[PDB]
Subunit: 138 residues, 2 copies
């Protein structure tokens, strides 16, 4: 739809920052479309990732960091508030100790800071979604 995907935007984050995303999966959940949001340390797509949030719709969520080019300890959740065929509103808030991921207004995932969020310079939203809103609070 509206915004280009992969969507890349420079960004600065600290405690109190929120990244809000509105979009819709490109396929029914039976086909397991993905959604990924990556908080990068540089504008380059190959740069380190402080927080990677990857949804396999209908199946699971995996979260991780990529540090010095290597993926670290993967974390997995089977929590699946996303609804088949529906638009979703996703909100990632930077708390002192962690990211809080809200889905359609409900707290759904958390991920402890492995690297200070001040290291983030860029956010990328990609994989099997259409995107209508991307906003960073400043």
């Amino acid at each position: 739809s509206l915004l280009p995907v992969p969507y890349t935007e420079a960004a600065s984050l600290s405690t109190g920052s929120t990244v809000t995303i509105k979009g819709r999966p490109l396929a029914c959940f039976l086909n397991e479309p993905y959604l990924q949001v990556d908080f990068h340390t540089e504008m380059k797509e190959e740069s380190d990732i402080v927080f990677a949030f990857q949804v396999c719709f209908g199946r699971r969520v995996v979260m991780n960091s990529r540090e010095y080019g290597a993926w670290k300890q993967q974390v997995e959740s089977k929590n699946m508030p996303f609804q088949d065929g529906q638009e979703f509103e996703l909100s990632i808030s930077v708390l002192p100790d962690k990211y809080q991921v809200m889905v359609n207004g409900q707290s759904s995932y958390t991920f402890d800071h492995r690297i200070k969020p001040e290291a983030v310079k860029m956010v990328q939203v990609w994989r099997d979604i259409s995107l209508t809103k991307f906003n960073v609070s400043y």
Copy 2:
């Protein structure tokens, strides 16, 4: 680039048919973009899949069928002829007993027919690629 992705095309297959695809991953291999080619029994995206071919670039390939709405026995290969950052040419030929997947001219994967290829009515190419050529031999 040129063709819309997800790309959907009605198709009929039998022994001797070849599906040729030219495209390029949308991200470096470090980011693990996917490619998927699905041979569907109906035009609907939720219909059964006689052969699902899913590349996680730089990591693995998984192949499966979805029968009566249920994914069946997954098959996995770590063969990875795809080259980071490069355009690829992918060719899926229907042999009497199996699909043969050629990558840039080299035989790379096979998948035995679980359902006759004559059951196919539609092919979908999607996930993290740009697509410049899609052709079915008739």
